[model samples]
Target: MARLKNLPQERPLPLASLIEARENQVLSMALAQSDRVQISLFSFADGESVSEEEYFGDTLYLILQGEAVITFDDQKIDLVPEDVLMVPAHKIHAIAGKGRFKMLQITLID
Candidate 1:
């Protein structure tokens, strides 16, 4: 059973805060190495894209807002709110999107 941990207000973390200077993009939250699960949010600018990258563990992406196109091994999958994607470990994957984008990237370490 997994229960939520109460988080108190803390000073801003620049790396975690979305800056207006970065167009309309923002990555305002993160939870790193604190649990077997890794969680974070990302925002991208219009016409912006992320290059292909491989991972070291099983991972999933849950689209929380806006939209994106996920390319996996020459395949493309469109995503929207509440959509969950399972991407195999050590595989090539990338995302391209427009507008405000936010998603929960979860990597299972165990």
Candidate 2:
């Protein structure tokens, strides 16, 4: 991955414009990071999916636009822009965009 630009500093910014979704592409970048916390943004094209993985910390996904389907092991959970979901630490999870979508990922470690 190439270096991702950081969020603009000290100004009002619209979240949706930070990244653009391309055909068959998934875009992501870290907006902020600290010792135990990290913030990220994701842009997904329709039918595109992020690979399954697990984190040592609790991972939170905040839907920003469109719809997302989260798979936790064998269970499928649907998310809309009006909602948020937390995946417990060390759990397998992946996300797919129902259509063009944007999302935020917040990771909190102990």
Candidate 3:
């Protein structure tokens, strides 16, 4: 069985406090994870990005602060605070942060 570890604080947990941005580096924190799904927090400074890749399952991306661009094939989606995006499994994609981006990422594995 999967157990929760390093869970966030009580209600009103500030997601922004989860990560510290570093020069030329993208930071991430695993919030909660289980067999069916997993949740994480990612932070990136402006111009930081993750190269093209594909997930094994669908993913839910919620922009908590700043902005970012999600690119898939020939399409690009600009995301800002409160924006939510669903990415299908196995679809090639890339994410680039714009102006100190922060987001909550959820992946469905089952």
Per-candidate RMSD, Å: 5.8, 3.9, 1.9
Off by over 4 Å in 2: 1-5
Provide TM-scores for the models.
0.68, 0.81, 0.85
Alpha-carbon deviation at 63 in model 2, angstroms: 0.7
- Candidate lDDT (C-alpha), each: 0.65, 0.81, 0.82
Give candidate 3 misplaced runs (Cα > 4 Å). Answer: none
lDDT by residue for model 1 (1-110), tens: 44333233475444323322245444445655455766666667554547787877888887766677888876888888678898878988987665556666778665
Tens-digit per-residue lDDT, 1-110, candidate 2:
33334877789688877878666778888877566777889888665767887889998888888888988867989998867999989999888888888998888766
Report the error of model 2 at residue 66, Å: 1.4
Question: By the TM-score metric, which is better: model 2 or model 3?
Answer: 3
**Candidate topping TM-score:** 3
Task: Give the clash count for model 1.
Answer: 0
RMSD after Cα superposition, model 1: 5.8
Worst 10 residues of 1 by lDDT: 13-22
Scored by Cα lDDT, where does model 2 land?
0.81
lDDT of 3: 0.82
Question: Considering summed lDDT, which 10 consecutive residues are worst modelled in model 2?
Answer: 1-10
